[PDB]
Each structure stands twice: as C-alpha cells, then as structure tokens.
Amino acid sequence: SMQEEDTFRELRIFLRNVTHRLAIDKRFRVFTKPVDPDEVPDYVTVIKQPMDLSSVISKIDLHKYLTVKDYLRDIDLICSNALEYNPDRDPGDRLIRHRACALRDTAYAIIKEELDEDFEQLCEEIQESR
Numbered sequence: 001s002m003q004e005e006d007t008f009r010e011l012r013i014f015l016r017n018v019t020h021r022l023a024i025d026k027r028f029r030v031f032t033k034p035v036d037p038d039e040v041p042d043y044v045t046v047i048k049q050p051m052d053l054s055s056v057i058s059k060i061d062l063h064k065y066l067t068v069k070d071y072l073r074d075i076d077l078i079c080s081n082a083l084e085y086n087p088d089r090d091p092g093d094r095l096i097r098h099r100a101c102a103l104r105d106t107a108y109a110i111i112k113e114e115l116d117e118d119f120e121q122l123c124e125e126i127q128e129s130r
C-alpha cells in the first residue's frame with residue numbers, strides 16, 4: 001500500500017541514522033569500509049562474507065533490510081567475522097575483538113532505546129505477507 005511504503009522508508013531512515021552513529025565513532029573505524037586486501041591478503045579466504053558499515057548503508061539503500069532484525073544479522077556478522085579472523089591473545093587481536101563486541105553492544109543498545117517494538121513488529125508482519 002502507501003501505508004507500507006512509508007513503513008519501510010522509516011525503517012531505512014532509522015537504520016541509516018544508527019549506522020551513521022556507529023560509523024563516526026573512532027573505535028569502529030576498522031569496521032567502516034571493506035578490508036584492504038593488501039593489509040590482510042588472506043581475509044577473503046578466511047571470511048565467507050565480509051561485512052562492513054559502508055556495505056550496510058548500501059544494503060539499506062538497496063531495500064535489502066525489511067526488518068531491524070535482518071539489519072542486526074549484518075551487525076552481528078561484522079562482529080563475528082572479527083572474532084573469527086582475529087582470535088589470538090596478542091593485544092592487536094584483543095583490541096579489535098573488544099571493538100567488534102562494542103559495535104555489536106552499541107547497535108543493540110541504541111536499538112533497545114530507540115526502536116519501537118510495535119514498529120519492528122509491523123515491519124515483520126508486512127515482510128511475512130510476502
């Protein structure tokens with residue numbers, strides 16, 4: 001309907017704002033763009049699907065997220081990837097794993113405080129009717 005196009009445009013607005021707020025945080029710089037293959041030449045082999053906050057914006061714009069839940073899958077992907085690709089005790093790995101977890105925790109916390117559950121529920125129901 002028209003009532004439904006609006007619902008997803010509002011979602012896209014919501015998600016772009018949250019994503020922007022993560023992307024401007026200095027701790028998450030490492031997650032903002034796709035990996036530089038010169039810096040980590042084996043990344044593509046170790047990680048099935050790279051994900052990053054730039055890509056998440058592109059996906060929002062491509063109407064790829066119909067629910068916040070689907071969005072959070074990709075935030076969770078950004079984080080799990082980092083935990084997978086940098087597992088070691090060394091401080092460089094610990095630092096990025098911390099930041100990965102902090103990204104994930106921040107996203108969820110913004111969403112907890114700012115997403116209306118009835119809005120998310122409406123998004124899920126319009127989605128389920130397709």
Ligand SMILES: Cc1cncc(-c2ccc(N[C@@H]3C[C@H]4CC[C@H](N4)[C@H]3CCC3CCS(=O)(=O)CC3)c3[nH]c(=O)c(C)cc23)c1
Pocket residue numbers: 030031034035036037039040081082085086090092093095096
């Ligand atoms: C500028 C840039 C562009 N593209 C990719 C990266 C990048 C580099 C290194 C790692 N992982 C390292 C694996 C081994 C070797 C050292 C250490 N363990 C680890 C470096 C950790 C470092 C990352 C940059 S920081 O400023 O956040 C401080 C901690 C990378 N690992 C990744 O998972 C990603 C997404 C990129 C990346 C950087």
